[PDB]
Write a protein that binds this ligand. Sequence first.
Ligand SMILES: [Mg+2]
Ligand SMILES: [Zn+2]
Ligand SMILES: [Zn+2]
Lengths: 144, 392, 49, 1341, 49
Amino acid sequence: KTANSGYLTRRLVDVAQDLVVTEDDCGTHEGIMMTPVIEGGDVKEPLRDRVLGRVTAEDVLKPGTADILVPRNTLLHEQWCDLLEENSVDAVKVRSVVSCDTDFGVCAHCYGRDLARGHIINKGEAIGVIAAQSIGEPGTQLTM
Amino acid sequence: RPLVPLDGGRFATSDLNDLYRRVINRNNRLKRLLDLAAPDIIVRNEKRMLQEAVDALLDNGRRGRAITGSNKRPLKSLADMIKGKQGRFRQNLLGKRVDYSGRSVITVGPYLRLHQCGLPKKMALELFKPFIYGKLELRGLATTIKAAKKMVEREEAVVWDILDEVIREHPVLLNRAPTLHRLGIQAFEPVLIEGKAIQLHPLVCAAYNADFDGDQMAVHVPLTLEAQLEARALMMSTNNILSPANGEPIIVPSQDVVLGLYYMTRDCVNAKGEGMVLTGPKEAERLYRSGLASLHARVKVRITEYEKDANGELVAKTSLKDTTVGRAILWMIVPKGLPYSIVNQALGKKAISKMLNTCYRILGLKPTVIFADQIMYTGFAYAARSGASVGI
Amino acid sequence: DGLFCARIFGPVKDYECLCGKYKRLKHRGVICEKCGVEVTQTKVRRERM
Amino acid sequence: MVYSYTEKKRIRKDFGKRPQVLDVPYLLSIQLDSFQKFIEQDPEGQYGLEAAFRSVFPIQSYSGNSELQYVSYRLGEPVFDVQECQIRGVTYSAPLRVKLRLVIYEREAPEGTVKDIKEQEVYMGEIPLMTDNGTFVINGTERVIVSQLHRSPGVFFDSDKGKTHSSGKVLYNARIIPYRGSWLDFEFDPKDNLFVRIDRRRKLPATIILRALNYTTEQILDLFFEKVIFEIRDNKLQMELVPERLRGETASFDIEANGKVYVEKGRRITARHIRQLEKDDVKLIEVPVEYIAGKVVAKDYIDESTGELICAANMELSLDLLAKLSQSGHKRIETLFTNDLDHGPYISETLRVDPTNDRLSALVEIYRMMRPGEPPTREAAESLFENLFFSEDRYDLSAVGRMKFNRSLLREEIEGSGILSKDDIIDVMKKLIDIRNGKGEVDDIDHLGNRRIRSVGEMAENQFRVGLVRVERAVKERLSLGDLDTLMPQDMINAKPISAAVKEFFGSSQLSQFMDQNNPLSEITHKRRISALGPGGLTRERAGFEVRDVHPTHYGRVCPIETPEGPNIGLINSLSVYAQTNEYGFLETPYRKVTDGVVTDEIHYLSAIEEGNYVIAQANSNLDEEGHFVEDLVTCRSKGESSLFSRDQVDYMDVSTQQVVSVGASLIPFLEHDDANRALMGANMQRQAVPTLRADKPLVGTGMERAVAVDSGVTAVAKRGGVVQYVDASRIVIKVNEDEMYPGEAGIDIYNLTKYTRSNQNTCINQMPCVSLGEPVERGDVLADGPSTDLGELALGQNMRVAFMPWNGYNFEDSILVSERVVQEDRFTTIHIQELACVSRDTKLGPEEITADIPNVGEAALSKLDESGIVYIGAEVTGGDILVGKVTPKGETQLTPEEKLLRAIFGEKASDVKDSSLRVPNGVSGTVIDVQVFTRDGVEKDKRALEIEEMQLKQAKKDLSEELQILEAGLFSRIRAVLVAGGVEAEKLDKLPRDRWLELGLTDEEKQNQLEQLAEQYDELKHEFEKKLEAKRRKITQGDDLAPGVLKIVKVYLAVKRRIQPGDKMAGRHGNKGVISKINPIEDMPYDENGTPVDIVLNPLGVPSRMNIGQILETHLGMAAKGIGDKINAMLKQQQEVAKLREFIQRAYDLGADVRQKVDLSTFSDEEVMRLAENLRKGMPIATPVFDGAKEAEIKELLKLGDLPTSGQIRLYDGRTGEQFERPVTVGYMYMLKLNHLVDDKMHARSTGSYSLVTQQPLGGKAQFGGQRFGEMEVWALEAYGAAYTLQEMLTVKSDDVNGRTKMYKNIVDGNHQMEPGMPESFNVLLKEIRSLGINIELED
Amino acid sequence: TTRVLTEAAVAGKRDELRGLKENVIVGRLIPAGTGYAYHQDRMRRRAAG
DNA sequence: AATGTGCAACAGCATGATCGCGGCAAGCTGATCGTGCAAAAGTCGTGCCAGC
RNA sequence: GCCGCG
Ligand SMILES: [Mg+2]
Ligand SMILES: [Zn+2]
Ligand SMILES: [Zn+2]
């Protein structure tokens, strides 16, 4: 299976090589709606895991109408995640890289914070190779 | 397309030379028979043969099931020998064998810091030859470059001192063979050791997927000012603590460190010392080390915690806590600002990574590095003190 | 006029030309009467086509 | 008697529990037997050289009336024995001398001969021979030849798993594989069409070959189908009744039996109606005309009125043709079954597809298909088809092929023609058809009844046969142009093709590889190896999951544990201990017969096929004294499965408990407590252990160590053991006892031990004697133990006091912490020997001379060189000191005055000649062991040559004079007895020499008969001694006939003692490996209450996640054994009286719960008991067989006897702080090995070196000063970091930028650390390579 | 590579060396990380002339 | 009601199938003739003057 | 081409 893993990671690296963070903020309103990953009778992915270190694309509303909890275009860190877990937020609209609409790259805000360091990502970080390596480092432990 | 040399003065024609010679032969024969008013069929046959030869030269293996020769193996034509595996894999495109590089077996050094590695003095003095030449020439020891080369060859004691000097703040970067992710190549400050095996800090092992059962690592020297700053500020083991795939810390205690931390922070119903009251962790360590109390004994200890509730300020609270001797001893290691509730458990490799994560998210980077080093030290020490063993 | 040639592809050894008519650094870019070899750095054996 | 002399010296405590029926075999039967069958004469041409010779000879010219008749052959005596042959570097081989004669026949008189020239033998070829250990010393190497596992020739049906067309339709294909030739394939098209594939070409309709065998359409339809008859008389149109065939069918109309209704229209189709119809005897009955509409006419009825007829086979019938045949008088019409219930429409479709129906048409079609060139002329197609199949020479499947062919088709006969007939193709086609219908089943291809083993003999025979046919094609030519003067040497003997083919196979082949030399275990494992690769085998990439898996028939034939790890897993295996080969070559395994309910002792060897039907018991089944089974319901294997069966149902029983595991894996004690993968790694790791300075027996063994040590051949084993007469560190001389003696010339046995000698892996091969003096020795005892052997018992490691505990992180992961006492006691110190060679070869400018005087080199370097220019024996060299001084001359003929001044001031050479001397390669050290200078015939002898030759003469005469002295002493004794019988002068007769002038004459009879015969015998003895000594001296001193260019060869040996160090790799035999981390001082290690410190500290965390409980059990058993040894050594220290020592040793040996070992010291006298106790002082070498060894209770009670804690754990005190560790620590004695992976050969570093001519990048690997490869993924990681400048310097300056390298070096030496990058040469090379195509690529601005 | 070069050779296209593998092959600073800053200086000069 | 067109199934062919590292032999194996003549170049046996 | 190492 190591040969298959190596070939897969080669393909991923080559498809994703030409992608670096080039802009501070594209300014788009587009985003991706995120909800806890649920199937059947058990919880699999809580919203805290799926939203941590991402930038909100729209204002999050408490079930009480017309109460702005966290403002638009902000980075969610452990404090924000804990605050939204204290309330009952269930779906959060956070911008993702598939809607950055910038040319030959990705906005530093559409892409969340880099997982290696707590701060938001800096311009010029080659994120395609990092993503390919992260996806391809496992696979040697996937039972095919 | 160099010619293969052989025994004596005889030379062996290589692949492309054979293909070119064949093409030239057929072209010359066709040219000579064109002017002889040869019949149409022989001219046609020679034209076909020339076309076939040119195709075999330009890309062998198709249209004629290869042309082979002298080994019953297809001949390596122009297309096949582009670059290694026909692409740019081997001798281009990130495939270069690099100079100023070495390789050796890795062993465990528990005395190291998080940013240090062990480099043999024989492996150095060979990676750092031009630097040592420069230092010898600049100190006035060897004026001519020949004198410096001879002095390094004879390896006097002054060469060793100068080598120790040039190593001082020059990070060298080690990597393991299957560099799966980016944490598989990291820059450490070398420490010269008398040996032949590279000594690797245990904590980083999980990043490398490296066990000390015959693994080998390669050492590269970043011989430039910009490269040195890049190794120090981008590839240092103190820089990449969290894995850039999920954000969870990747330099975490493993194996013996976890066993030591778990054995230290446990309790038993009856032990030496029960409900005894201690003025602080120092008294707990004194009681354990001198033998008047057990690591698992349950006591009441006066503990002072620090909170960062104020805006960037640490405020202290002192309280009497029901804990064990081992947890109190461990508390002398946690940096100020973390609650005592992170120690009042068993710390089974899930609490310890969580406590490192909270240290990173609350205190910063450098206190977390100091904390990780101290955790590894104390875990090894108390695992050895524990004497845990497997029996039938 | 061979596959390995000295009139083309440049010289074989340093600045020396075949037959040793002009073989030194004093002569440069000169083509011998006997052999069409020119005196140059013989690193052009990797470039002349 | 009960115990041999060598076993009496140290008796292991076997744990047994089950008597062994048959002992382990030779362990080398495969290679020795295969080569013996290949070489030895056979009066029937069954196998070997004689078989090939009878296959080829006799051969005659094309009606030339001249023949070569073959009569027997012979192999000459080898010129050099294996020792000298390995020393010089020549192949160990023997000549072939074949006796053949010419017969020239009469041209005028048919079948008559006119000339018969019977010349002597003619020489061709040089056949290598295998030594007594099963190795071919060729070109001065070892070169074991590995057995091959391939597909036995025959017929194989396959199902391709039924996923080809994604329609779910299963396609069955049959394949005929010859031993030598081209295969046949029959395949099914999902549209249900037969297809035939010859030589794996495109598919063709199958009926072409049937037409090619002179088979008409009617005949093939009759052969491949059964035919029924429809009778239409008086418009009745009756049908024959076949109730068996009418199983599933719908009644289209009323069915009446003899005018009475039997089955209604669409009535019940159950078996009851069929049985009722069959019970009633009913003749043919009328049937509706609608049913016959779908039928197809089989035969071709002929009209009696006109020649026109309906011969269209595979055609249906119309209403008009019914009237036509009625007019023609066709009362009965033959039509095939056309019934699809179990059968089906087949064959007819293929013939409908292809319209050819004539033999010539089929032959021309197949000739065009096979050969797409020129069409034939009735002669090329026929010859081509003859050459494919039913050809005596072009096609041949061997006897195993014919056997498999007959068995697959259930034919009673087994022996048959090794060539295809016309009927077997029909039979295999019908078998494919029937397996399609459902009768029969597809067979497994991995089954060991379908995989054969080719050993050395068969492959050598095949290569010799290839060479032989090649020589025959040549010798056939000349016979038409040869007169009566031609002789066999001139008969185109042509030794060159034969010798070239055999040497090419033996030296450079896929399955003839360097034999590993670490330990005797790795040797013995490599010798008995099964390889699935090879010429006629399969490649690594072309093998799927299924081929490299463990098939249920692998039980007692192929080891399930021992196999390489990464690429070759499952493709390389080792035979089990007991597996052998059939007469055909399939693997068989011993078993014990069961009669009634008892287990008898007769042993039957069962193959893979035969064992499938018998019910086979298990090795560990309890038995009573009478042999019956203790329990009624026992475990068994019936057909590739296992279950519980009754006591009277079984048919065979396992012979022993080592049947499953190989020789390598049967050495791991407590194997049953190890994970299968960890056991695999341990077995593969035992073979890499390096022999140590001193062998140390395993305290915990298995008992197979004696077998490995003895049958590996490294040791010296007696063959006519009597009483040892002389012992030396080099020789052992034994006087054979009188009970066995060859009459005449008396006889003694001399064993010359091989002293320090390099192995293939550059270890040391050393033999030291085991016997002292006057010690009786029996046949089969060991005299000297080779590398890593102790008293004839395999000892490839050392016993180390191992404590399982984490220690300050120094045994993190798998690292191993070692005490300084291990280094101090010189354990794990290994001697490594290296080769260096120098050649004095001729040159255009003159001859190369080896002289001590080397120009330009001073006296200091020449200090270690003698007057001949070669280093002194025992000189310690390192770095680059000169070993031999060789001088290369230079050509100078334009005599110039400056050279005159140079020649005048300095010597006559004036250092004109260059020097090219042998220097130690850098980084190598050692002491010179031996120098092996060889000289050419005619060239003057070197100074050291006379010394070496005189040493050889002195050794030869010293070794040969012993028998001379014995014989002369015997003759003198006989003469003394004779003179005592008459005229005895007592000591005076012994005072004078020559028996005091033969004691005059004395009596007439004694003088004429006794004295004369004694003198005659004495003078004949003197003469034979003189002549044999002269012959030996002439043999030793001669000029070697080396290569034409070379005039002198010099070989220098170096030896260096590598001591253990942190980087070194150490491992136990339970898969637990590691590298050392620290060499702790003695006082820092943990110690027990007795103050004795441990030697090795291991990590316990490596036990539970790896599942090696063999580790812990071996540790406890070693602790118990060392406890008993300590008790014995204590009772020996205080000089305790013998009887109590005997009683204690008896108590130790009488332990265990019903063990089969019954060693009793009552029969032992005092001396042997004292010797044994002194031998058990270090510990009791107790042994546990593989799967039935020591139990928990036995280990605990063994510990109890030695006054050790039964828990196996003691209290350990810290060596640095003195505090007791909180928990008890497991301490014992584990037997550890030092693998060949040392940091001395694995540390490398480079800063500048030599670069490749093209691409100008650094070379690769050590021994060439290479740089580490910055591969693709490394650059990916650097890009992920964002490291642009480091990446740029790694891509241009460090590697490929030609000017960037020099600029960067100058900047560093200056101290600038500036890059100044540039243009990699690799990209310029790529641009030139692309431009050399028809493509223009440039650099724009 | 046979297919990619063939379609590139016919179309007569150019690379412009914008990605990472293009710059690594020719030994230039990659446009990511510490080389990102250097690549921006070159881009503005190209636009300005 | 016979006819032409567009869509789909089956066969053949191209492509690629992890990264480093260490050690050992044997192939690595490799030739276009002669031609017979001027034309040139070189070489050899011989005689020359200049130094001791 | 073979063998092994992680
Ligand atoms: Mg490893
Ligand atoms: Zn964006
Ligand atoms: Zn010239």
